[PDB]
Paper text:
Thus, in the room-temperature neutron structure of AAT, after the crystal was soaked with α-methylaspartic acid, one site reacts and closes (chain A), whereas the second one remains unreacted and open (chain B). In the open monomer, the Schiff base (SB) is in the internal aldimine form and PLP is covalently linked to a conserved lysine residue (K258). The closed monomer displays the SB in the external aldimine form, with PLP covalently linked to the Cα of α-methylaspartate. The out-of-plane geometry for the SB observed in our neutron structure was also identified in other aminotransferase enzymes, with torsion angles ranging from 43 to 96°13. Overall, the experimental evidence demonstrates that O3′ and the SB are deprotonated and likely carry partial negative charges, stabilized by PLP resonance and H bonds with Y225 and N194. More importantly, the SB C=N double bond is 46° above the plane of the pyridinium ring, which indicates the lack of a hydrogen bond to O3′. A strong nuclear scattering length density peak for a deuterium appears near the NSB in the external aldimine (chain A), indicating that the SB is protonated. Remarkably, the peak is not between O3′ and NSB, but is instead located between NSB and the C-terminal carboxylate oxygen of α-methylaspartate. We found a deuteron positioned equidistant between the NSB nitrogen and oxygen of the substrate C terminus oxygen in the external aldimine, indicative of a low-barrier hydrogen bond (LBHB). The neutron structure shows that K258 is neutral (ND2), corroborating its role as the general base catalyst. Moreover, in the internal aldimine, H143 and H189 are neutral, while in the external aldimine H143 remains neutral but H189 becomes protonated and positively charged.
Residue numbers in the entry: 1 to 412
């Protein structure tokens, strides 16, 4: 009897956020509510394909001049240019000086992967897998997984969330920067921090930038929610743009999954800013090799939609309107969920619910409370106490606020 070559493969733990989408879908209880994955939902609790996207899909579908031939390894040129322009702004001195590069990627995740793979080979030496990599405490789980997979052995965290203050621990963060070895890589959330929903103010960003510049720390921005932090694309990109004006060289992993609602078309872009043009050229050539052995070349549908919307003043205007619409609904739900919790006179303060920005809220519930909420009330969320505000609708608001109350009460 010959045994199987897969006999010893262990059962892996499940990617939780996707594990719950499954549990939710198949859960038969009617009063179930998915406050899990960070995807927008209308007030009717439905996915929303943006009107502008619908528009363009139709145009693309009626364009017979378009073929399916392979795209360049680095991706659709028009897309890479518009994506980078969106984050840096058209008046960017970096764009003017041609020291900006863009690599089309598979969502923000793919962009993060490509940048980590490049750094692990050409940054701070050759194949230097030892440069420390810093992620916020807490942060999006996949930050660790992505950098670990790229080979970095030393992943550290910088203090960010202050539990006994329910906000940003600036001194902690600043202290961690001061103490970070020179050349260390810092993974920064450009805006709408995940999972806290707490971002530094421009004044704090200035302090953060000041230490980074002094200690030659590398800013690797994750920008997955441009436009959600406030509803304004220009505003949500200010930090990245400030670093650029300060002369930093940096990476910016861009995702169009949430702001274009193109979740399943995997549209991402890795923007690179260098001190001089010649370097962008050499960098992209190394990036081509990395891409070639990962996905060979990127898919066209998503990039085509984003490219057409961003290069047509009319589609662009319209898109900015749809974005603001989503952001506005998140602001509306924050005020409501807070009201109800106060009316129910729920133990403790809950101002933070309206203080945090973006799609998420770091509620503050112990895990035992989350288990109660998921098992008893069928209100799916993460163990950490993070909730997707978009999951709230004028309907289920009371059920949730009730459940959160009962929890806090007969659970604490
Ligand atoms: C901070 C951050 N960066 C990158 C990504 C990846 O975006 P992509 O889909 O373009 O690769 C996410 C997505 N976070 C989600 C919305 C989903 C997930 O975990 O993948 C979340 O629920 O946190 C994110 O929250």
């Amino acid at each position: 009897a010959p045994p199987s070559v897969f006999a010893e493969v262990p059962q892996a733990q499940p990617v939780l956020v996707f594990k719950l989408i499954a549990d939710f879908r198949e859960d038969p209880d009617p009063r179930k509510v998915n406050l899990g994955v960070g995807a927008y939902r209308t007030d009717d609790c439905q996915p929303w394909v943006l009107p502008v996207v619908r528009k363009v899909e139709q145009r693309i579908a009626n364009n017979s001049s378009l073929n399916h031939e392979y795209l360049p390894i680095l991706g659709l040129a028009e897309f890479r240019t518009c994506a980078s322009r969106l984050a840096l702004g058209d008046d960017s001195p970096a764009l003017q000086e041609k020291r900006v590069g863009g690599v089309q990627s598979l969502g923000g995740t793919g962009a993060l992967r490509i940048g980590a793979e490049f750094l692990a080979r050409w940054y701070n030496g050759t194949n230097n897998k030892d440069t420390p990599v810093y992620v916020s405490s807490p942060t999006w789980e996949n930050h660790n997984g992505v950098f670990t997979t790229a080979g970095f052995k030393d992943i550290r965290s910088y203090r960010y969330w202050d539990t006994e203050k329910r906000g940003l621990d600036l001194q902690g963060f600043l202290s961690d920067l001061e103490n970070a070895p020179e050349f260390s890589i810092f993974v920064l959330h450009a805006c709408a921090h995940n999972p806290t929903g707490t971002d530094p103010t421009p004044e704090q960003w200035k302090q953060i930038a000041s230490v980074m510049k002094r200690r030659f720390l590398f800013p690797f921005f994750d920008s997955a929610y441009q436009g959600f932090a406030s509803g304004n694309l220009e505003k949500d990109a200010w930090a990245i743009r400030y670093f650029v004006s300060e002369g930093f060289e940096l990476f910016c992993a861009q995702s169009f999954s949430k702001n274009f609602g193109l979740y399943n078309e995997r549209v991402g872009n890795l923007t690179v800013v260098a001190k001089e043009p010649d370097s962008i050229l050499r960098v992209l050539s190394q990036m081509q090799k990395i891409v070639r052995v990962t996905w060979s070349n990127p898919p066209a549908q998503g990039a085509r939609i984003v490219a057409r919307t961003l290069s047509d003043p009319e589609l662009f205007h319209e898109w900015t309107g749809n974005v603001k619409t989503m952001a506005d609904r998140i602001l509306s739900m924050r005020s409501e969920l807070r009201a109800r919790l106060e009316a129910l006179k729920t133990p403790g303060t809950w101002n933070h619910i309206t203080d945090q920005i973006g799609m998420f809220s770091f509620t503050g519930l112990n895990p035992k409370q989350v288990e109660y909420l998921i098992n008893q009330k069928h209100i799916y969320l993460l163990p950490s106490g993070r909730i997707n505000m978009c999951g709230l609708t004028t309907k289920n608001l009371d059920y949730v606020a009730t459940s959160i109350h009962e929890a806090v009460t007969k659970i604490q």
